Amino acid sequence: EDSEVEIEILDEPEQGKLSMSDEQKLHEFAIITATDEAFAQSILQDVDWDLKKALDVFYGSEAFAEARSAAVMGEDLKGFEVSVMSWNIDGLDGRSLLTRMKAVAHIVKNVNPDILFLQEVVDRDLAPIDKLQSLYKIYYSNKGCQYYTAILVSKMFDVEKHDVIHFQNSGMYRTLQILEGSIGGLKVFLLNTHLESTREHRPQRCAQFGFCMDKVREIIAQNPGALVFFGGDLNLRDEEVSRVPDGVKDAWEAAGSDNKTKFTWDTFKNDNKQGFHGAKMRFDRLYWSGPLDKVKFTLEGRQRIRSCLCFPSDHWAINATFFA
Amino acid sequence: EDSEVEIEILDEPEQGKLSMSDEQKLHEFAIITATDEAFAQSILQDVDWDLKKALDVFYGSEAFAEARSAAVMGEDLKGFEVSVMSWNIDGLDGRSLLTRMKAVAHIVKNVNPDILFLQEVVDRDLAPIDKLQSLYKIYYSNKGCQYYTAILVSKMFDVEKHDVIHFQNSGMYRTLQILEGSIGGLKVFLLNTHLESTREHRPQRCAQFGFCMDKVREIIAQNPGALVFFGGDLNLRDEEVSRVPDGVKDAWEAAGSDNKTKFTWDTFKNDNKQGFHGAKMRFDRLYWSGPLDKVKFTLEGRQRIRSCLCFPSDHWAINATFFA
């Protein structure tokens, strides 16, 4: 009654056709979609061989956008490398703070990363870290606080935005520090954080982690082709790690999960802190997304300082190099 | 052996706990996630009551980003309206072309839309349409062609980009015309198209439609908060309409699916073209996404021109007004 009425074609067969076999489906799908039978064969064998929903999938499903683009319409990064370093420098440890901070600056200069994430930075004896400003642009998350985080980037790195999100469920002043910029024509996002500490704060830490991954997921959706780096001292236990978004990988895992570079906080090997029993964790991690698919991963800051016989920090630094 | 070793807490109960009932799950989920039992109750009743995957869902699932944001962290458009008009003006009909084009410009001036999509524009007798440049910024898809599409926007509309994608599976010069801009602080995307004509070209038309919806989906993902308008002469039969992306709606349907405004090409009522039997279709449609949720929908150009006794076009124009 209020249904559409189709245009008559005078020399067209005057009956619409009307079950079938599997090869009939192959052919039918091919004729209807104007695609070949080999492509038909791909779709229909991921469902019972239901022609009706095979059509809906070809036209409507998000998985087949490439196929639709091919049906309708029919890199510069080789030789490019970028290194990211992350280090909880334990500024809250007053013992040999100045000497340790000098060692930190020395180690940073030797490793020479393009991008450096720092956690537990304090105002006291910050001078040698501030000296890095000759080589880096320095962004402090929350200056005026007992302790905070920093992002240092090479002078070639153009910065557009610096945002700091304060976790409201944190009793430890923890934040998400976000730096948006670019290296040449390539857009880059940096997300540095120090998640809630200690096993008992698992609820806070796990909520924070998932929130951070939500932010990463938003950045990726809004910036195709961009490089995204998220990490820092995440204080994670392996079983705490929730689902990471599509296209995001753990740098240490993508480098081959080397046992020799696994633990970043290790009291068996680092005696800056001492318990009755040794403990060890992969607290410091780095995640990335973007048009670089290969990665090398090493630990740094593992040499005992000779003047005072301690390590720069109770953490090892992680150093990841991404390339294509 | 290469497993992590947890920090000892001297005054902590020295045994990890270890099946349970439904209220135990409620409590457990509440303690673990540091959320209440009422919120726990929501998740667990969308799965068997599997605590393990209830946790994974809370932390990892994309559906619960708002919940995570609330756990970690804890409009201007009222009074704003925008009208979009779309009209296949049938420039390929030489009969009374100049008079009909004058009527088109007259009708456009009376309706006074902010945004106008035109299809089947030809160079011949284009003068009255070009006269609209005093009121509109005019963008032609493919000038130099037998026929093409246009987008006209109010002078207040700032334009950043004009792109035209030529459908390679089209034997009728069909394109996707994309205008990116803004009205005030509000970003706006316009997608105008004339999909492959005739029932027989269903394969081409349906592929084009899904491709266009892919583009809409990309724009939405990359531009949260933006207004997106996609439509034109889509030549669609109801059964041809594939899945539209999330947050996208048909303007005529959202206006209440009025039978009095359904058909846009109706030979029972429009005699610019004559068959032995009447035909009628909702060929012209408008889809939108963005921060406006209400819509009014009317048909325009339904008056017979008095000097030559024909309608401006064999199509009715569609006119949608979006507001909050």
UniProtKB/Swiss-Prot annotation, chains A, B:
Which Gene Ontology terms describe the biological processes this protein takes part in? double-strand break repair
Site annotation (Interaction with 5' end of substrate DNA) points to: Y147, W265, F283, H315
InterPro entries documented for this protein? Endo/exonu/phosph_ase_sf, Endo/exonuclease/phosphatase, TDP2-like, UBA-like_sf, UBA_8
Identify the Pfam families for this entry: Exo_endo_phos, UBA_8
Domain of life, source organism = Eukaryota
GO-annotated cellular components:
cytoplasm; PML body
CDD domains referenced in this protein's UniProt entry, alphabetically: TDP2 (cd09080), UBA_ceTYDP2_like (cd14672)
Phenotype upon loss of function: Suppresses axon regeneration defect in mxl-1 background mutant. Suppresses the axon regeneration defect in sdz-33 background mutant.
What are the catalytic residues? D233 (proton donor/acceptor)
* Chain residues that bind Mg(2+): D90, E120
Region annotated Interaction with 5' end of substrate DNA, chain positions: 88-92, 194-199, 235-237
Q: What is its main location?
A: nucleus
Q: Where in the cell is it found?
A: Nucleus; Nucleus, PML body
* MF GO annotations: 5'-tyrosyl-DNA phosphodiesterase activity; identical protein binding; metal ion binding; nuclease activity; single-stranded DNA binding
Q: What is its EC number?
A: 3.1.4.-
Acidic residues bias (residue ranges): 1-13
- Cofactors: Mg(2+); Mn(2+)
Q: Does the keyword Calcium apply?
A: no
Q: Which UniProt keywords apply?
A: DNA damage, DNA repair, Hydrolase, Magnesium, Metal-binding, Nuclease, Nucleus
Subunit info here reads: Interacts with mxl-1; the interaction promotes axon regeneration after injury. Interacts with ets-4; the interaction is required for the sumoylation of ets-4.
Q: Which family does it belong to?
A: Belongs to the CCR4/nocturin family. TTRAP/TDP2 subfamily.
- What role does it play? DNA repair enzyme that can remove a variety of covalent adducts from DNA through hydrolysis of a 5'-phosphodiester bond, giving rise to DNA with a free 5' phosphate. Catalyzes the hydrolysis of dead-end complexes between DNA and the topoisomerase 2 (top2) active site tyrosine residue. Hydrolyzes 5'-phosphoglycolates on protruding 5' ends on DNA double-strand breaks (DSBs) due to DNA damage by radiation and free radicals.
Name of protein: 5'-tyrosyl-DNA phosphodiesterase
